[PDB]
Amino acid sequence: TEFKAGSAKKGATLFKTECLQCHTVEKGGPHKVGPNLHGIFGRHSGQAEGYSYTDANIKKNVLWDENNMSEYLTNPKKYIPGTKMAFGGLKKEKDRNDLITYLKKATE
Ligand SMILES: O=S(=O)(O)c1cc2c(O)c(c1)Cc1cc(S(=O)(=O)O)cc(c1O)Cc1cc(S(=O)(=O)O)cc(c1O)Cc1cc(S(=O)(=O)O)cc(c1O)C2
Ligand code: HEC
């Protein structure tokens, strides 16, 4: 995948509709169905403190960046078979770029 910097404004809306159900982004924010996402970029997968992950999410051991995040969010179970993230994916390229542009800011 080839991430291109988009609109964090549009991305914030996408996060609210597609992700917020299962995730928070703020430092010190709570785990929900899914892990809090603060500090995700530049950290290996399956490491949010206090959250119990699948073996698949831990053993993937991917250093998250904008490009591999874009592949993951296209089709989560295809990138990490055995995941328990029940999200089908964002099939539209502009949606992935906008979402990731937001996530880079919101998880810092
Ligand atoms: O910065 S903005 O988010 O406000 C913006 C709005 C519009 C834009 O046309 C663009 C930016 C430029 C643009 C960027 C990209 S990116 O490189 O992926 O970031 C892609 C496109 C684009 O026009 C092409 C494009 C793709 C899609 S997709 O099917 O979802 O992948 C939809 C659209 C595209 O133009 C339609 C579209 C949606 C939107 S939306 O408000 O985000 O829904 C704004 C604008 C649009 O032209 C009108
Ligand atoms: C619940 C129904 C979810 C929705 C909707 C989304 N996510 Fe999720 N995510 C969820 C779980 C249960 C998990 C852990 C999965 C496991 O196998 O253990 C995740 C994981 C992620 C990750 C990886 C985190 C890590 O520390 O490696 C990311 C980056 C992630 N989720 C992001 C994300 C985004 C951006 C979403 C909206 C598009 C989204 N998720 C939806 C549960 C759920």
Swiss-Prot record:
PROSITE patterns reported in the protein's UniProt record: CYTC (PS51007)
Stored Pfam families: Cytochrom_C
Coiled coil: none
UniProt KW Heme keyword: yes
Induction of expression: By oxygen at the level of transcription. Expression drops rapidly when the oxygen concentration falls below 0.5 uM O(2).
Annotated heme c binding sites: C19, C22, H23, M85
Modified residues (N6,N6,N6-trimethyllysine): K77, K78
Gene3D superfamilies for the chain: Cytochrome c-like domain
Note describing how the cofactor binds: Binds 1 heme c group covalently per subunit.
Subcellular location: Mitochondrion intermembrane space
Gene Ontology terms for molecular function: cardiolipin binding; electron transfer activity; heme binding; metal ion binding
One example of a Gene Ontology biological process annotation: mitochondrial electron transport, ubiquinol to cytochrome c
Main location: mitochondrion
UniProt PTM comment: Methylation may enhance its transport into mitochondria. Methylation occurs in fungi, plants, and some protozoa, but not in animals. The precise role of methylation at Lys-78 is unknown, but it seems to preclude pro-apoptotic activity, possibly by lowering affinity for APAF1.
Keywords: Electron transport, Heme, Iron, Metal-binding, Methylation, Mitochondrion, Respiratory chain, Transport
UniProt cross-references to SUPFAM superfamilies, sorted A to Z: Cytochrome c
Family: Belongs to the cytochrome c family.
Misc. comment: Present with 7330 molecules/cell in log phase SD medium.
Purpose: Electron carrier protein. The oxidized form of the cytochrome c heme group can accept an electron from the heme group of the cytochrome c1 subunit of ubiquinol-cytochrome c oxidoreductase. Cytochrome c then transfers this electron to the dinuclear copper A center (CU(A)) of the COX2 subunit of cytochrome oxidase, the final protein carrier in the mitochondrial electron-transport chain. Isoform 1 (CYC1) is the predominant cytochrome c during aerobic/normoxic growth.
Name of the protein in question: Cytochrome c isoform 1
Encoding gene per record: CYC1
